[PDB]
Symmetry: C2
Subunit: 129 residues, 2 copies
């Protein structure tokens, strides 16, 4: 929940289909495309963490870039109100979870539950739980 | 499957997190902000299909907004490779499968397999 934390978070979960995440320069690019002078290193130093605490414009820019609200960055709660769906994304990019979802999509609720229950058996078994 | 639909297919699949599908108006405005200009009711009739076969450049600026490639409208290869994969959501979203899918993410490589195995063990109990 540093700046660079929630920032990179975006960088790793929000991006167009058939496609990987945006580059820093891809962001910088879009930033000049709406007329915004942010130095490309000024992205890096902030993603690394060399001097956190950026200004609101500096924040609202890249919130509006990813097309989410900058309350994400400020309000610790919206961060959490969001991150659910936001995590949820990097969930469904996972083959395995895909395969599973696919297969178990045709069982009855009753049988799909055993799956859910079987799932639990294995997280416990891994020390996940 | 025609532009008026392919463009309508996009508003209803591609939209940002914690957000509703994209709006035509906010589509026009967002382009304008680039310095890029486009009519409101052109698009409206465009989406109605009351004016098809648009500028090669009209398609581009428009894909650019949705952050996808322009081929989505021309190239059906890229398309089917998408919208059916874009069709993943509603079938794999809010189903109850939601939890099954989101619990299962944490799992290790071997574990997910045991779950794949467990499913056929359950399908078999019906017919497979």
């Amino acid at each position: 929940t540093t700046f660079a934390a929630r920032l990179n978070r975006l960088f790793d979960t929000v991006y167009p289909p058939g496609r990987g995440p945006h580059t820093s320069a891809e962001v910088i690019a879009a930033l000049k495309a709406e007329g915004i002078t942010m130095s490309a290193p000024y992205l890096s130093q902030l993603r690394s963490g060399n001097r956190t605490n950026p200004s609101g414009a500096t924040m609202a820019a890249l919130a509006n870039f990813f097309r989410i609200k900058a309350a994400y960055f400020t309000d610790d709660e919206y961060y959490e109100k969001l991150d659910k769906e936001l995590q949820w994304l990097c969930t469904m990019r996972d083959d395995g979870v895909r395969r599973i979802a696919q297969r178990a999509h045709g069982l009855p609720s009753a049988a799909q539950q055993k799956v859910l229950d079987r799932i639990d058996e294995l997280r416990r078994a891994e020390g996940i739980d």
